[PDB]
């Protein structure tokens, strides 16, 4: 789903890994971690994203985040080839 | 806003510097940058946050992001002019 710019998938994973490494590198708490993500998006919306895209991409973000909000509620899925 | 943080800004800022450094390091584009933040929040909402605390903390994050979304809010004028 190309709702976001098609960057290299493995690249995204590698970037996430290094970011998570920095979190571990400073023993970042869940709150601190999630607030750090907030700071990231904030800087995007401040000095990086388009003004016109700003509310749309933020809504897209929130909607995606809501649809990525999961729990151990999965019952009879197709395959556990997912993390 | 002093919510969610409570942590030393010295600590937070230096972590942010290293986190953003990884993004600059890999020449992360705006959408990639913000999608990285999304994956971060998602991971937190999966493994780090509590189930009961999940939706609240997610809303908390979104609302904090909306308020950190700094578009031109209410340009002060003294004419009550129409256009």
Swiss-Prot record, chains A, B:
Pfam annotation, one family: DUF1414
Family: Belongs to the UPF0352 family.
This protein's name: UPF0352 protein VP2129
Species of provenance: Vibrio parahaemolyticus serotype O3:K6 (strain RIMD 2210633)
Organism lineage: Bacteria, Pseudomonadati, Pseudomonadota, Gammaproteobacteria, Vibrionales
């Amino acid at each position: 789903m190309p709702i976001t710019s098609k960057y290299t998938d493995e690249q995204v994973e590698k970037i996430l890994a290094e970011v998570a490494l920095v979190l571990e590198k400073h023993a970042a708490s869940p709150e601190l971690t999630l607030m750090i993500a907030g700071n990231i998006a904030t800087n995007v919306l401040n000095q990086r994203v388009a003004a016109s895209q700003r509310k749309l991409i933020a809504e897209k973000f929130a909607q995606a985040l809501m649809s990525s909000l999961e729990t151990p509620k999965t019952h009879l899925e197709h395959h556990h080839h997912h993390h």
